[PDB]
Design a protein around this ligand. Structure first.
Ligand SMILES: [Mg+2]
Ligand SMILES: [Mg+2]
Ligand SMILES: [Mg+2]
Ligand SMILES: [Mg+2]
Ligand SMILES: [Mg+2]
Ligand SMILES: [Mg+2]
Ligand SMILES: [Mg+2]
Ligand SMILES: [Mg+2]
Ligand SMILES: [Mg+2]
Ligand SMILES: [Mg+2]
Ligand SMILES: [Mg+2]
Ligand SMILES: [Mg+2]
Ligand SMILES: [Mg+2]
Ligand SMILES: [Mg+2]
Ligand SMILES: [Mg+2]
Ligand SMILES: [Mg+2]
Ligand SMILES: [Mg+2]
Ligand SMILES: [Mg+2]
Ligand SMILES: [Mg+2]
Ligand SMILES: [Mg+2]
Ligand SMILES: [Mg+2]
Ligand SMILES: [Mg+2]
Ligand SMILES: [Zn+2]
Lengths: 85, 129, 144, 80, 148, 79
RNA sequence: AAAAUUUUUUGUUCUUAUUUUGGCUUAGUUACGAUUAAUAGGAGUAGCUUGGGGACAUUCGUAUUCAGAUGUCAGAGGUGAAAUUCUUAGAUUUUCUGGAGACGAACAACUGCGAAAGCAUUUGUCUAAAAUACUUCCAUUAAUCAAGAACGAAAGUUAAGGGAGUGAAGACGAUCAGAUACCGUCGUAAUCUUAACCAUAAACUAUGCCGACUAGGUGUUGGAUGAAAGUGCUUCCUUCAGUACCUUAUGAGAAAUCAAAGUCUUUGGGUUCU
RNA sequence: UCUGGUGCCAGCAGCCGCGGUAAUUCCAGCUCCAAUAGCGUAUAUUAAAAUUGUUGCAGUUAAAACGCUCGUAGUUGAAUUUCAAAGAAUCAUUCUUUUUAAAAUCCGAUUUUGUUACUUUGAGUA
RNA sequence: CUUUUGAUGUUAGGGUAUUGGCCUAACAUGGCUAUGACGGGUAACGGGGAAUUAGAGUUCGAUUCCGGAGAGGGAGCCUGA
């Protein structure tokens, strides 16, 4: 059965801290705990190991990325600018 | 979409007759239209008519005699028992001495006087004054 | 087409629409509402009996000018209080402080009539004798 | 889904006098099925009345006709 | 039109004569052989008809032989497991889905994809009512990309 | 009147609006210079048609009738 | 191969053959075996086909404003008339060089595209949509739709940016009997971008959607067919699809007016909502 | 449109209204009208109401088309398979008599040849 | 919505004048529902019938006959076809 209506992941925080703070935490930690595509080996098995390091469970390559996601738009834009030139 | 060919045919005939056109064309044809036209021909309301053969549903050209007042269908084909004809004809026809209400009967298509003569009922199709 | 279904198997739709749309008629809703047994002093009767409590005079509406004579009555049946008009010329002088009177409607069952504002009742008998036979003054005298 | 017991549905049209038209209606009937037949949800069966066998059963099946449907059995309309 | 507002009436119309024209010289046998050879190269029935109209001289296949293209194709068990027009609809849907996965602000493409998938479901229901598709044929919107 | 329309007027309407629907296209024989070969072609063709002996273009697809190679002569096929 | 009867091999255990019933392999013969292709629908193919349909990136323009320079001197703004305001510590005005944010004049129309809300500088890449042409394929696959789903101007809410001009609130100066207003000088949120909500407008053609029929003329946007003036391009004719206007209706309305708001006591083509 | 009284008072009047010193409407006298051994009043209900509309309403401006599209149930869905012919009895008409494909039951004669809805005629009924 | 405490079926018994979850034991997971289940209201006993209506319809039926139920409110019991 569906065990929760709204809070989902943040049900571990109980009733503390206020509802909007828990909402922002939920938005961040959905991104932080996801799985990402490894463009080197093709499998979707890249997970965060520290605040800026991402490692693939299969080929074991380490990539420097963002804090809560593997890529950030500001770096994507700069890289695309340079590659276009 | 169409949903009927009899209603369109009768409506086109009625519209052409109000203007004195002497001839009109009916795009889709069927055996029911043929029987209805033959019955109007029998009572002297129209002239001869022609059936054109394309390799699809045919077409019809009829001759008009400036003589029809009205010809329309009753869309839901209600079924009528032999002893309910009187009420329907009282409601639908302009007089007790002329006009025709047409039924489809297990013995074919006929008006109400012939239906009474044959002791049968049926479902209603249309009428013409 | 004209906004209705006309097919040989479309009876449920027509039945249900007529059922739903009847509630917009004022007459039907007045006659079929469950609250009429509650918001009606007579409670469905045509006549009622009561005890006179107070005599009053009521103004007429704007274009007219008069002082119409009425009484205030407490019903025996349920204890409610109403206002009833006394018709005739000097007929208020036939009524004492707390007599028993029959009252009826006033002709427009739920509505006020003519010149009086907010009066829907009319006295017909006082002290077990008719008001008309008492106004004719040649027929009967008050039951002393 | 029961043991040697099935449910069948019957469809019919009801006439309304005021509007001169019809309606769709249905009623369910529990029946007994013997192991000599092999039925599935969608077939046509013929049943005959017997004495009461339980709280709800008074008919049992005598003949089966194979038939194929495409939606759920409760959504088909057949008159016979 | 089924979805938009168009009211065009462009179409082809057949001649009155149903028999083969008097100047045509082929035999039905090599016409069927041409059908089979041309389908071996990977052409759909409509493309086959167009090619026979233009590159060879054949106004209508049904006038010369007695059968239509799909029947003579099915006589040798060559017809595809998925009918043609349904296949084209699925290809369009998968292309639109890829583009949309790349661009999340393109609202028009969302509308058009909804319309195409409604069409797919309706046509699929029609084909399943006949025995042309297995009864447990579903069209999941995620596994359709690999459907060759 | 309505049963016997003037054929000059009828050849002026849309193909779907005349009493008997008839197509406007036809088939024809094309003889291009210095090729000594007769080929059947369809007016309103949609592909590019080649000569059998030498691969020379006979027509070019357009939005209506096909465009014939310059210098070629055509003749209708009767039936 | 499987069974009913004929005799049958000697009062019960005792022997054999018959025709006929249904399945089975085996090669031939038969008039042997499939309705159109809807001025219904879906798909397809073609054209240096059409469009201010959508998304992302990219490019240009004056204006305004900030800053730096530049030359000269007494006012400049603003109004019905004035005040508030700026100014010899150089205002306003002219000339040049840099940066910033929004916007896209003239062309531009009783013209184009989109389901509606909406959409207007250049170039590229994705992405759909008509319309026309067709002797291509399928063969009824369709119309309208309670529940349910997608999108939905302006304002408003949340977070991070950006922040020139305009400017709900607020503060001043005037007019007035009063003026918390109309006029004027400042000016905060907002207006713009990215990620999420909200689901409303005179969201109007105040006219639901699909199909049939009924009248003449003048235009205009996009194809196609057929003929002439041409330095395979224009003008004319015919036809399909959008889109306006004029005249008139033994047609309609209470009228205004209407090409549908007509074909309705001569009342019924299908269907949803009020 | 008769005679007296009252004078926005008293009162009447289902509705429109009457009454402020010359009231055809109040209070009375006379005279007339209606139904009549019967005639008024109150409440409910039917027709009138085509103002609940299946027969049979209305939705530009009078009350009223969802902001727009998709969509399940429901409602509604093109044309095609045996069409004819030849007599009679009838005041042109009505009623009928003959059968022109095929197969299975009488050594070229008889009759049989998908289901429902629907309509005709019967049975049974205080 | 129903089903712990019979709701829907199967097997074997008990009981009754007989069939039946009518009741008991074991076993399976069923049964109904937008074509309106489960609930609320009725100044609701059902019918043969009554009033008014051109034809459609709308409203009434405690009350001569037929069927049902009760004897201040509930539950038990004897005699007896
Ligand atoms: Mg639709
Ligand atoms: Mg077609
Ligand atoms: Mg333009
Ligand atoms: Mg901010
Ligand atoms: Mg600023
Ligand atoms: Mg300012
Ligand atoms: Mg912003
Ligand atoms: Mg609104
Ligand atoms: Mg509106
Ligand atoms: Mg009408
Ligand atoms: Mg008098
Ligand atoms: Mg009434
Ligand atoms: Mg009525
Ligand atoms: Mg009436
Ligand atoms: Mg009305
Ligand atoms: Mg609208
Ligand atoms: Mg138990
Ligand atoms: Mg009773
Ligand atoms: Mg009672
Ligand atoms: Mg009594
Ligand atoms: Mg009784
Ligand atoms: Mg008592
Ligand atoms: Zn990897």
């Amino acid at each position: 059965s569906r065990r929760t209506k709204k809070v989902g992941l943040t049900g571990k925080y109980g009733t503390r801290y206020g509802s909007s703070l828990r909402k922002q935490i939920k938005k961040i930690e959905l991104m932080q705990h996801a799985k990402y595509l490894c463009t080197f080996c093709g499998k979707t098995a890249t997970k965060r190991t520290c605040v800026g390091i991402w490692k693939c469970k299969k080929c074991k390559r380490k990539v420097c990325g963002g804090a809560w996601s593997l890529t950030t738009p500001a770096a994507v834009a700069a890289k695309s600018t340079i590659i276009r030139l | 979409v169409r949903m009927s060919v009899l209603a369109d045919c009768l409506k086109t005939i009625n519209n052409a007759e109000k203007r004195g056109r002497r001839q009109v064309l009916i795009r889709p044809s069927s055996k029911v239209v043929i029987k209805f036209l033959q019955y109007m021909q029998k009572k002297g309301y129209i002239g001869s008519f022609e059936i054109v053969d394309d390799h699809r549903s045919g077409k019809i050209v009829v001759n008009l005699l400036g003589r029809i007042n009205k010809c329309a269908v009753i869309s839901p084909r209600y079924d009528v028992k032999l002893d309910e004809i009187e009420k329907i004809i009282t409601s639908i026809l302009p007089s007790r001495l002329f006009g025709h209400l047409i039924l489809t009967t297990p013995y074919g298509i006929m008006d109400h006087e012939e239906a009474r003569r044959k002791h049968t009922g049926g479902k209603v199709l249309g009428f013409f004054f | 087409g004209s906004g209705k279904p006309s097919g040989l198997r479309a009876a449920r739709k027509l039945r249900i629409r007529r059922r739903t749309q009847r509630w917009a008629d004022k007459s039907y809703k007045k006659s079929h509402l469950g609250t009429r047994w509650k918001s009606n002093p007579f409670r469905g009767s045509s006549h009622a009996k009561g005890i006179v409590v107070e005599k009053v005079a009521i103004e007429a509406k704007q274009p007219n000018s008069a002082y119409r004579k009425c009484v205030r009555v407490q019903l025996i049946k349920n204890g409610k209080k109403i206002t009833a008009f006394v018709p005739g010329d000097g007929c208020l002088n036939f009524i004492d402080e707390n007599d028993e009177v029959l009252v009826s409607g006033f002709g427009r069952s739920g509505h006020s009539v003519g010149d009086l504002p907010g009066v829907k009742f009319k006295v017909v008998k006082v002290a077990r004798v008719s008001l008309l036979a008492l106004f004719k003054e040649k027929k009967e005298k008050p039951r002393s | 889904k029961m043991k040697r017991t099935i449910i069948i549905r019957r469809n019919y049209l009801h006439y309304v006098k005021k509007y001169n038209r019809f309606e769709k209606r249905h009623k369910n009937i529990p029946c007994h099925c013997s192991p000599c037949f092999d039925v599935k949800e969608g077939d046509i069966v013929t049943v005959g009345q017997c004495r009461p066998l339980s709280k709800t059963v008074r008919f049992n099946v005598l003949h089966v006709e194979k038939h194929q449907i495409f939606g759920s059995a409760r959504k088909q309309f057949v008159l016979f | 039109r089924m979805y938009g507002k168009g009211k065009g009436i462009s179409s082809s119309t057949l001649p009155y004569k149903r028999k083969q024209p008097s100047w045509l010289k082929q035999k039905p046998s090599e016409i069927e052989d041409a059908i089979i050879k041309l389908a071996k190269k990977g052409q759909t029935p409509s493309q086959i008809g167009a090619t026979l109209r233009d590159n060879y001289g054949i106004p209508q296949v049904k006038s010369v032989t007695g059968n239509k293209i799909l029947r003579i194709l099915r006589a040798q068990g060559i017809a595809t497991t998925i009918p043609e027009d349904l296949y084209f609809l699925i290809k369009k849907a998968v292309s639109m889905r890829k583009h949309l996965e790349k661009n999340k602000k393109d609202k028009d493409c969302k509308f058009r994809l909804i319309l195409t998938e409604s069409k797919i479901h309706r046509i699929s229901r029609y084909y399943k009512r006949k025995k042309l598709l297995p009864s447990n044929w579903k069209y999941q919107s995620s596994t359709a990309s690999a459907l060759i | 009147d309505l049963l016997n329309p003037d054929p000059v007027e009828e050849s002026k309407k849309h193909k779907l609006k005349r009493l008997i629907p008839t197509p406007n296209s036809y088939f024809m024989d094309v003889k291009c210079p210095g090729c000594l070969q007769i080929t059947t072609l369809f007016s309103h063709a949609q592909n590019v048609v080649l000569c059998g002996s030498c691969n020379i273009m006979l027509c070019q697809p357009t939005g209506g009738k096909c465009k014939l190679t310059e210098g070629c002569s055509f003749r209708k096929k009767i039936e």
